[PDB]
Amino acid sequence: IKDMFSSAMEVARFEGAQIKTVSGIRGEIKRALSKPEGHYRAAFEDKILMSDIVILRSW
Amino acid sequence: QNDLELQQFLRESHLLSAFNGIVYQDDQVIGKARSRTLEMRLNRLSRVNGHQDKINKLEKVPMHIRRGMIDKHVKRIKKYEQEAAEGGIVLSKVKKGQFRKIESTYKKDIERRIGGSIKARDKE
Amino acid sequence: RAWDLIRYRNFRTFTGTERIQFNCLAVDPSGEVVCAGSLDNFDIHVWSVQTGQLLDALSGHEGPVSCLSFSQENSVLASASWDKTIRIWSIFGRSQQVEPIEVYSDVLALSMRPDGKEVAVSTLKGQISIFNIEDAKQVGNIDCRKDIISGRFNQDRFTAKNSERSKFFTTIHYSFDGMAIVAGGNNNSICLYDVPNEVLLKRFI
Amino acid sequence: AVPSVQTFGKKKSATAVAHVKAGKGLIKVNGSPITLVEPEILRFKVYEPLLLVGLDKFSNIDIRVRVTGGGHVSQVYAIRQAIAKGLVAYHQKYVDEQSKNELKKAFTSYDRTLLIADSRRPEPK
Amino acid sequence: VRKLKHHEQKLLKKVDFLEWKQDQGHRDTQVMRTYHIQNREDYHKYNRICGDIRRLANKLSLLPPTDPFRRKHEQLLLDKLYAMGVLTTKSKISDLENKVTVSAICRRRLPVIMHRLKMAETIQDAVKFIEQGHVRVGPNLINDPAYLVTRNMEDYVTWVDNSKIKKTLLRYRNQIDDFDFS
Amino acid sequence: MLRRQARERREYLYRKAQELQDSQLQQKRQIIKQALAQGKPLPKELAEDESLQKDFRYDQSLKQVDDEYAATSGIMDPRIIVTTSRDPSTRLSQFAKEIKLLFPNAVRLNRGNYVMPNLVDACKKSGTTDLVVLHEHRGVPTSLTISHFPHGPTAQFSLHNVVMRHDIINAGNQSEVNPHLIFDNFTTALGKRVVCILKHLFNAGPKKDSERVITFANRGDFISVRQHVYVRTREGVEIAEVGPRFEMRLFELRLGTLENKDADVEWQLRRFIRTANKKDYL
Amino acid sequence: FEARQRIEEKNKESSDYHAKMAHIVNTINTEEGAEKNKYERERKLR
Amino acid sequence: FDRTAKPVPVITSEVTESLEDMIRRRIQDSNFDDLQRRALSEELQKAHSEISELYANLVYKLDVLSSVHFVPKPASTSLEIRVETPTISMEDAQPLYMSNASSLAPQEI
């Protein structure tokens, strides 16, 4: 997942959070990728598409 | 009245004496006494909630031999209770349309084929 | 079960743990261990004779163990089964060594040379193959399914030429000089051969 | 219409189908001749079914082999197995059984892995 | 036999030239038609054994319900018939009266085993093939249709090698290796 | 034995489907059993069916380890292979050494070029019972899969806080005697299933004074595995820690061997469901 | 650390709320349906 | 934000201490979850004898019908009395013999 964070520190702050696509596919962020900074690895209920947007509902 | 083993022995005293100290308690009752005893218990339990047209199904016997079965059984009943009446002997009391249950009733398994009473006359 | 032929007593009885029926056995030369194989279990059951216990269950055949024989000199076990495989087990002394020799078809009646050097197996193709045990390579075979007298039954509707009922040997045995093999099966010919030349010496009706 | 015979030779994942029939004497692996089978140092591994028994057995029959799978040495072992047991099966079915088991004896005295592969492995010690 | 009129059919009702009461509804004929049984007396040779099993099962259910003799022999007979293949489940002992049946002993015959193993397209084809001598159990060729195949002994029902049927299935998938004759 | 094992699994799952299908007759036969016991009237459904009572005459003589392990529970000792993933690192080879020392009747197999289908076939015709496949991540071992072989279950776990006996110190040699076991709060039916899986790979009947013990203590779906030796003093019992400690978490449990992944899943970790983190042995 | 603490406090809050709502539902059921059935019983006499 | 699952527990000295004294309680009470190594009546007697001979005949013809591939009887540690006698006398009727020992061993006499 590309750009909801600006740094791996930010993703480290937000690890384990539950996200979802706009299709309601639930998911969880797992680990920040190393070289592209705000990019991370998430796991979903099944295969999401390239035309989706993930969402971290915070308050 | 709420003793179970005592009342089971009381109402299965007849076929224990027909198919036999004596044994009466289950885990000691050998074959035909066991089959008819268990069948009698299951009938008496199932006659509460089960339907009366479905609990006591008679064995299908043809007309001209079931009527002869009934006539010879009633001849046995009349001869027995007449012999006891001309003797002193006090007999147990039956209802009005029922058959008197005798030793040939318990041995010959006659009530599966003829019922306890002619239910056409009971209905009318 | 074991029988003393002095006091005429069955002194030992060996069962398994799996309730199987045994079809062939093999004893040690130095009779410490009896061994037996079934046609419904794929294992070989290894019992001590001195105590009565089940010493081992050898596993590794993927077909019913048709025949067992202990080598009389070096005491190596040879089993052979309907998964087209003869197998050589070094049981004694820390080895637990298994050498599987594959063969062309499913084996019934292995037999063992008196010096334990070679093993002759009878196969369902109709052949008797002879293998060197220590260097597990075939020494030589006899092709026996064309000198077999297979008669015609009364009930069957196929000729004795085209029948596949009895053109193979279900029992073979070495001579005691190691040079010949007598063989018989479900047919009315028994044939004996000399294993150097692999040629039929004589056939008996 | 022709007397023909099909056999199979296998090593690790190579597999070779050999059709043997009566003919003029041509031995062709994958369309090309047998004298083109690379890696060219194992061409005698391919040749030894011919040189063990003589070319006068192959003077009247033509073989063709189709080899898929595997690597270089697994393919030459599949080729030699297919050729060997195809010659044995042809001499069984259409020539006499005495030449059949003479061929089996010669190949088995050289190595029986020309005729029977080593197939199912390992051993769980 | 001539479709009696109303007065005749009323006057002789019990007349039937085909179906009698001793026939038991022609069930020997019915299950021997189902499982293609050659000889007439195989139904009744199996019916004797079903009557043995059910006679023992009656006389064994007439024992008291807790003694180990009844429980051991009921379980032992149940295990034996499941292993032989007549019974399809060794769970309940009412199988020893209800589910023991000439059709179960007939489903264990060799052509029916064959047809269920997809080894022949019908039971009559399986009869023809094992009469023609194509089928071996284990190593030895089985020649008669009535052969009863137990549960562990149905793993070895194959064709004989050098069978034309084995050759044509191998050559249908062109896996025929002519080295081992098929 | 290919055809025998295929048709034996076929008959077993036929019998299991028939049990769950006709398991209503078991409990209504239980109802009429206790109706004979205390003379209380029988319901209408159990009162009007005549066939069930005349089967009950036959069926009045009817009456822990489960269906895969039940045949040979204490009869026969296990036989375990311990193998790594493929081309393993040296710390995974050290961990596989430690797991083969954990389980008695376990050997270790070198892994490389072993396909998992013919590995499973070689094991289940050479007679082994269990296979433990270990997976790593840069040294740190991350999973172990236990496959019980006569078409039994596979339990797949992840391993989480792994400290190794090779990693700590030369504290000596291990004990290798048949240990005692401890299972702490395995309370659900999945807990008993996992207990039976994890404990039918130890030898039956250790000595009563067998001086090593190994504990599988459940702490919210995180089975802490430690191994201890002990010697009972005058005042308590003194515990020393020996051999590896980790936390395994079951994420999958299916009903076939390792090769297929077409087997029916008994349980697997629903991670993304809405009420995921609210229950244990979920 | 905040993960474990927030999850377990949310679980505690949900398990308290479900108990509280089920309690008030069946107390309204029991101690007022007894009066509903009492009124129906003394209305059936009319 | 809400989070999906609880994190993996950190193993500190408190949880190792709690786990060790759990182990100590179990190990001093020997609470170990190990694997554990695996005449009547006249009428009842004659009922038993009748179904025994029925069972014998039925098992015989089931074996012969099954073409004697069967599964054997489970186990019976029976009890045999053998008297002592010459093994001449334990033989068949023919002119010869094979062994003239006594059927009981010296350590059985």
Side-chain angles (χ1 to χ4, degrees):
Chain A
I1 303 302
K2 209 198 295 183
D3 43 10
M4 34 190 291
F5 298 123
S6 46
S7 86
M9 306 284 177
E10 267 184 330
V11 193
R13 165 97 183 135
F14 277 79
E15 303 295 338
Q18 43 173 71
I19 56 189
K20 71 198 204 75
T21 71
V22 307
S23 299
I25 298 169
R26 285 92 69 97
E28 165 176 12
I29 94 173
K30 300 288 206 193
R31 200 156 164 86
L33 264 64
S34 69
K35 29 190 192 299
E37 207 62 34
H39 297 199
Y40 56 92
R41 169 178 47 89
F44 284 85
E45 275 183 350
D46 69 323
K47 181 183 172 184
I48 73 177
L49 299 186
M50 205 54 187
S51 86
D52 285 14
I53 293 96
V54 310
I55 287 153
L56 203 151
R57 176 186 77 172
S58 201
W59 304 92
Chain B
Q1 274 218 41
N2 296 129
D3 201 295
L4 199 73
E5 181 184 88
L6 168 81
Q7 294 278 105
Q8 283 182 357
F9 177 57
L10 274 190
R11 58 187 165 247
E12 303 146 14
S13 47
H14 280 298
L15 46 90
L16 263 53
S17 88
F19 307 116
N20 44 16
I22 79 156
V23 306
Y24 50 86
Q25 61 277 42
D26 40 359
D27 83 354
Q28 281 185 356
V29 181
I30 316 297
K32 206 183 274 182
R34 200 202 152 264
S35 68
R36 293 208 202 182
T37 297
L38 163 76
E39 159 188 323
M40 174 171 208
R41 293 181 200 163
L42 282 164
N43 265 340
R44 208 187 158 275
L45 290 177
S46 42
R47 80 163 74 259
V48 175
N49 281 135
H51 204 87
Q52 51 171 129
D53 310 302
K54 300 165 81 60
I55 51 171
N56 40 9
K57 279 285 299 185
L58 263 64
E59 211 203 40
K60 171 195 182 321
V61 189
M63 180 193 174
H64 64 106
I65 80 165
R66 185 190 256 130
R67 288 190 76 257
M69 273 178 178
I70 292 178
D71 294 3
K72 199 197 180 62
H73 193 254
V74 171
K75 275 184 57 64
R76 269 198 301 268
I77 279 166
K78 289 314 171 192
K79 189 243 185 187
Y80 164 74
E81 73 179 29
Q82 185 251 342
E83 192 270 327
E86 78 200 357
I89 308 164
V90 171
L91 303 169
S92 85
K93 297 207 294 317
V94 309
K95 306 220 193 73
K96 221 185 168 188
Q98 314 283 109
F99 294 125
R100 164 169 302 279
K101 311 187 85 194
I102 45 175
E103 189 178 2
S104 50
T105 292
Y106 289 108
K107 211 182 303 162
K108 295 169 80 71
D109 202 323
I110 202 72
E111 84 172 16
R112 185 180 295 134
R113 278 96 201 165
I114 77 180
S117 51
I118 295 179
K119 50 174 73 78
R121 311 278 87 82
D122 292 1
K123 172 175 184 290
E124 90 178 11
Chain C
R1 62 188 59 207
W3 305 87
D4 198 25
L5 287 183
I6 313 154
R7 317 300 186 88
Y8 292 160
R9 47 163 67 177
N10 169 41
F11 63 92
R12 260 310 176 278
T13 312
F14 315 96
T15 65
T17 42
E18 317 206 349
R19 283 294 104 193
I20 54 185
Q21 50 196 20
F22 292 128
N23 279 112
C24 61
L25 62 91
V27 307
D28 220 352
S30 71
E32 176 197 296
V33 52
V34 80
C35 210
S38 180
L39 259 54
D40 54 1
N41 202 63
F42 319 119
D43 280 1
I44 310 162
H45 285 66
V46 173
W47 290 282
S48 161
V49 185
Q50 199 59 258
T51 175
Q53 60 185 353
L54 197 147
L55 194 140
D56 199 357
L58 313 170
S59 70
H61 284 299
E62 40 174 353
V65 189
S66 89
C67 41
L68 270 304
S69 179
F70 263 94
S71 155
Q72 291 290 144
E73 291 284 43
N74 56 321
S75 60
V76 73
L77 178 68
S79 55
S81 50
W82 299 357
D83 62 327
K84 320 184 164 46
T85 302
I86 166 180
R87 198 171 279 235
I88 313 295
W89 319 77
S90 300
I91 281 179
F92 297 89
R94 292 157 159 154
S95 87
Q96 314 171 316
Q97 278 292 122
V98 192
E99 173 81 49
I101 314 166
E102 281 213 342
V103 78
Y104 299 83
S105 67
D106 52 313
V107 187
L108 35 97
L110 166 141
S111 181
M112 170 75 52
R113 268 188 90 184
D115 52 357
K117 293 282 159 297
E118 296 173 332
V119 46
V121 291
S122 168
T123 47
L124 192 141
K125 288 295 193 248
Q127 302 186 0
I128 306 177
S129 299
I130 299 146
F131 295 88
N132 189 16
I133 283 174
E134 180 68 28
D135 314 277
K137 47 168 286 303
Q138 177 170 169
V139 174
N141 86 319
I142 319 165
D143 192 45
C144 314
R145 74 165 278 153
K146 276 176 162 322
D147 44 31
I148 270 174
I149 299 303
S150 176
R152 183 177 194 163
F153 279 26
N154 281 259
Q155 58 259 30
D156 63 331
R157 302 190 52 176
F158 48 93
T159 50
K161 175 65 77 72
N162 309 309
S163 163
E164 304 281 308
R165 183 184 266 118
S166 52
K167 294 180 188 36
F168 55 95
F169 288 132
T170 49
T171 172
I172 66 169
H173 197 259
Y174 261 117
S175 187
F176 273 85
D177 47 347
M179 310 305 286
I181 280 179
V182 73
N186 285 336
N187 47 22
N188 76 332
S189 82
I190 49 186
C191 314
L192 87 164
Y193 312 87
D194 45 349
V195 315
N197 319 100
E198 306 149 349
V199 72
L200 180 66
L201 292 185
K202 207 185 162 48
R203 167 172 85 198
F204 309 91
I205 299 307
Chain D
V2 197
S4 175
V5 156
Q6 161 190 8
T7 50
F8 287 85
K10 299 199 183 56
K11 199 179 164 58
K12 276 151 95 194
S13 84
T15 174
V17 186
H19 299 260
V20 186
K21 71 187 190 56
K24 60 183 86 64
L26 54 92
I27 309 161
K28 291 213 166 317
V29 193
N30 278 125
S32 67
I34 190 176
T35 78
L36 298 186
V37 177
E38 306 298 323
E40 196 270 329
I41 209 157
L42 309 172
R43 204 172 282 172
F44 276 88
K45 290 304 283 182
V46 172
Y47 281 152
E48 42 188 36
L50 279 56
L51 311 172
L52 268 164
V53 301
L55 314 179
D56 49 333
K57 319 269 179 301
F58 302 86
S59 63
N60 293 118
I61 55 170
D62 49 330
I63 321 180
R64 74 170 174 107
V65 195
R66 290 289 320 183
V67 199
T68 74
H72 296 126
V73 316
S74 316
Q75 274 198 29
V76 311
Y77 272 95
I79 287 158
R80 67 192 282 271
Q81 186 158 325
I83 293 273
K85 68 164 74 183
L87 179 62
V88 176
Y90 191 86
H91 281 229
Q92 162 195 126
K93 195 175 180 186
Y94 300 113
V95 193
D96 50 54
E97 316 283 305
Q98 170 70 21
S99 73
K100 183 249 294 173
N101 45 28
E102 275 155 359
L103 291 172
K104 269 175 80 168
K105 189 181 181 57
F107 294 144
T108 314
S109 288
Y110 198 64
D111 47 345
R112 84 192 304 254
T113 196
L114 274 167
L115 308 159
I116 292 190
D118 38 356
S119 297
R120 70 102 168 167
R121 289 184 249 193
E123 53 95 10
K125 61 203 202 61
Chain E
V1 80
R2 201 203 37 80
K3 186 180 163 63
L4 306 172
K5 305 166 189 172
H6 188 265
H7 74 272
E8 293 150 330
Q9 152 64 53
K10 201 67 75 65
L11 204 53
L12 80 174
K13 315 211 191 61
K14 297 188 305 195
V15 161
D16 208 325
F17 277 118
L18 313 175
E19 269 184 305
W20 290 351
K21 204 157 296 182
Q22 66 103 38
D23 278 359
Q24 277 141 15
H26 297 251
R27 274 162 79 111
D28 40 352
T29 287
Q30 177 177 320
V31 319
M32 87 169 42
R33 217 167 285 259
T34 294
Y35 301 117
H36 197 87
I37 286 163
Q38 321 283 136
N39 46 0
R40 191 53 177 85
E41 304 278 297
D42 269 20
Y43 183 84
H44 309 283
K45 270 167 195 169
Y46 290 144
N47 217 17
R48 296 264 163 107
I49 319 172
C50 293
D52 296 355
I53 293 158
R54 297 166 71 189
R55 173 170 56 219
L56 177 64
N58 185 29
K59 201 163 291 299
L60 182 57
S61 76
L62 286 188
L63 276 194
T66 45
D67 60 338
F69 202 90
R70 157 175 182 159
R71 291 183 155 179
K72 165 179 60 194
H73 281 217
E74 264 175 339
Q75 203 47 59
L76 198 62
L77 187 58
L78 218 49
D79 286 15
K80 173 142 193 49
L81 283 165
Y82 172 70
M84 196 168 54
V86 173
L87 290 181
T88 49
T89 303
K90 53 163 69 175
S91 64
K92 58 168 157 287
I93 313 167
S94 318
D95 296 350
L96 278 196
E97 210 271 338
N98 291 102
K99 312 279 282 184
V100 51
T101 274
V102 183
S103 274
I105 316 197
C106 280
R107 278 192 288 278
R108 282 278 109 183
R109 279 159 66 104
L110 183 63
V112 191
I113 291 305
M114 198 149 310
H115 172 73
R116 275 192 267 105
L117 265 60
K118 310 286 182 71
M119 201 169 298
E121 269 176 339
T122 179
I123 303 172
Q124 194 181 50
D125 274 333
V127 162
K128 291 172 163 51
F129 288 159
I130 74 190
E131 277 200 339
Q132 279 150 19
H134 281 142
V135 158
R136 54 153 166 94
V137 316
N140 42 16
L141 168 83
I142 297 298
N143 191 30
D144 61 327
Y147 177 78
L148 196 140
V149 191
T150 85
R151 288 204 177 271
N152 318 309
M153 214 37 66
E154 68 166 346
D155 317 319
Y156 311 116
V157 175
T158 330
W159 273 291
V160 294
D161 42 352
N162 308 263
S163 196
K164 269 184 181 169
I165 295 183
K166 184 176 182 62
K167 282 204 210 79
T168 177
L169 68 95
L170 291 184
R171 92 156 61 88
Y172 160 71
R173 283 178 185 266
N174 57 36
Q175 286 177 317
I176 174 159
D177 198 328
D178 283 329
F179 184 47
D180 42 359
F181 289 81
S182 287
Chain F
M1 71 188 289
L2 205 161
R3 301 173 64 192
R4 183 185 294 268
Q5 286 192 345
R7 80 136 180 91
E8 260 179 7
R9 186 49 178 208
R10 209 183 57 220
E11 294 185 341
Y12 160 72
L13 53 90
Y14 174 74
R15 258 178 296 164
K16 183 259 292 178
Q18 280 273 126
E19 283 307 329
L20 70 89
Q21 187 255 352
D22 273 328
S23 197
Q24 275 74 248
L25 299 190
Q26 181 65 257
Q27 60 204 38
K28 63 175 61 181
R29 191 166 63 231
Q30 197 59 233
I31 289 172
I32 84 180
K33 189 155 302 174
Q34 59 212 8
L36 264 72
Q38 57 258 12
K40 60 193 305 303
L42 202 58
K44 186 197 192 75
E45 293 92 39
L46 276 165
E48 282 152 5
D49 50 349
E50 194 47 280
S51 159
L52 189 137
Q53 308 178 359
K54 58 156 56 181
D55 297 358
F56 178 65
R57 178 168 65 103
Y58 285 83
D59 272 323
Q60 217 179 358
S61 44
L62 277 180
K63 316 174 176 55
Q64 53 104 34
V65 67
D66 52 1
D67 274 28
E68 281 108 340
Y69 302 89
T72 171
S73 47
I75 294 303
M76 211 170 309
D77 274 313
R79 185 181 269 98
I80 312 162
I81 314 291
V82 176
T83 168
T84 66
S85 58
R86 196 154 168 158
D87 265 342
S89 66
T90 77
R91 284 195 65 247
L92 193 65
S93 291
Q94 292 169 38
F95 198 54
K97 187 75 182 298
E98 282 179 15
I99 298 302
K100 88 153 289 298
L101 290 168
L102 199 82
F103 307 137
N105 271 109
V107 304
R108 202 199 155 263
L109 196 83
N110 278 26
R111 176 82 200 269
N113 283 246
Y114 279 146
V115 192
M116 200 58 72
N118 56 9
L119 185 55
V120 161
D121 301 329
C123 300
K124 85 184 170 182
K125 74 181 66 75
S126 70
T128 81
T129 55
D130 293 351
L131 185 69
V132 180
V133 168
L134 278 155
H135 291 186
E136 68 151 5
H137 166 225
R138 287 193 69 166
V140 188
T142 49
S143 303
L144 66 88
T145 316
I146 302 168
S147 161
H148 182 247
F149 266 126
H151 32 265
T154 70
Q156 322 191 4
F157 303 87
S158 58
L159 320 169
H160 276 293
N161 296 308
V162 177
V163 187
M164 274 165 36
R165 195 183 210 272
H166 285 49
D167 270 332
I168 39 146
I169 202 164
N170 184 247
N173 264 2
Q174 274 203 20
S175 175
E176 292 179 15
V177 78
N178 198 18
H180 289 121
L181 315 181
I182 279 157
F183 297 93
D184 189 55
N185 63 100
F186 280 80
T187 58
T188 73
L190 186 71
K192 316 299 191 48
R193 179 59 148 167
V194 166
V195 157
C196 171
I197 288 174
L198 288 171
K199 90 170 161 177
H200 279 260
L201 37 79
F202 287 101
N203 288 341
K207 298 281 169 286
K208 260 192 289 216
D209 52 294
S210 193
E211 267 152 14
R212 88 158 180 176
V213 74
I214 163 171
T215 79
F216 296 88
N218 184 41
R219 297 296 140 88
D221 296 25
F222 268 98
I223 314 165
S224 299
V225 192
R226 275 96 185 109
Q227 180 203 330
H228 297 292
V229 289
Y230 72 104
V231 42
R232 201 181 278 99
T233 59
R234 273 180 294 264
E235 56 269 56
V237 46
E238 281 292 356
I239 285 291
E241 192 167 27
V242 46
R245 66 185 216 173
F246 40 87
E247 266 77 19
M248 57 170 68
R249 176 192 209 177
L250 182 89
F251 65 93
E252 213 173 315
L253 195 139
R254 60 177 59 213
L255 299 182
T257 48
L258 262 182
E259 45 168 279
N260 44 9
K261 305 292 103 179
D262 276 4
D264 288 329
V265 193
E266 171 163 352
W267 187 88
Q268 55 182 336
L269 181 78
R270 317 295 160 129
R271 180 89 169 184
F272 310 105
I273 59 176
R274 197 169 194 280
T275 321
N277 47 353
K278 285 223 201 312
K279 63 192 304 285
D280 284 355
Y281 277 157
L282 60 93
Chain G
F1 186 73
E2 308 303 281
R4 202 173 295 108
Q5 290 298 318
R6 200 168 194 278
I7 284 179
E8 70 193 17
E9 72 99 19
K10 181 191 180 57
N11 289 176
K12 189 193 198 320
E13 182 165 22
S14 174
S15 89
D16 290 352
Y17 154 83
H18 275 112
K20 164 154 56 70
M21 285 317 130
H23 180 273
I24 73 165
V25 161
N26 57 6
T27 199
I28 292 316
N29 268 356
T30 298
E31 74 184 10
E32 277 209 355
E35 283 73 13
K36 173 182 85 71
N37 297 154
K38 172 170 181 48
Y39 170 67
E40 211 294 318
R41 204 184 303 126
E42 76 198 0
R43 205 256 308 267
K44 203 41 79 175
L45 269 69
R46 294 163 196 261
Chain H
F1 48 92
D2 280 29
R3 297 161 187 85
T4 320
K6 302 194 194 65
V8 48
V10 48
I11 295 304
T12 66
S13 94
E14 313 278 43
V15 303
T16 53
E17 192 59 47
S18 81
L19 187 53
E20 283 173 330
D21 54 58
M22 199 272 305
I23 294 157
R24 286 188 201 114
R25 288 297 264 254
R26 301 283 284 265
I27 204 162
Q28 87 178 15
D29 306 345
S30 314
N31 201 19
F32 285 134
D33 318 332
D34 318 321
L35 279 175
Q36 280 324 293
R37 165 86 39 82
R38 264 177 179 171
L40 286 89
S41 294
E42 284 276 349
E43 193 45 266
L44 191 38
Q45 260 181 352
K46 60 181 299 188
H48 283 183
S49 91
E50 190 186 25
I51 64 176
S52 303
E53 55 92 19
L54 288 183
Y55 182 75
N57 308 337
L58 173 63
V59 165
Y60 171 69
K61 48 198 303 178
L62 280 199
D63 275 357
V64 177
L65 179 66
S66 157
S67 188
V68 284
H69 312 99
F70 63 96
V71 157
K73 292 150 37 152
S76 159
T77 177
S78 181
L79 218 57
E80 180 180 1
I81 288 176
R82 49 180 69 143
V83 312
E84 85 156 356
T85 184
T87 81
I88 315 290
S89 68
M90 273 202 299
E91 270 185 347
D92 282 20
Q94 90 271 3
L96 274 86
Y97 72 83
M98 204 199 325
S99 67
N100 59 316
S102 53
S103 52
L104 276 194
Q107 63 265 13
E108 288 155 359
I109 288 176

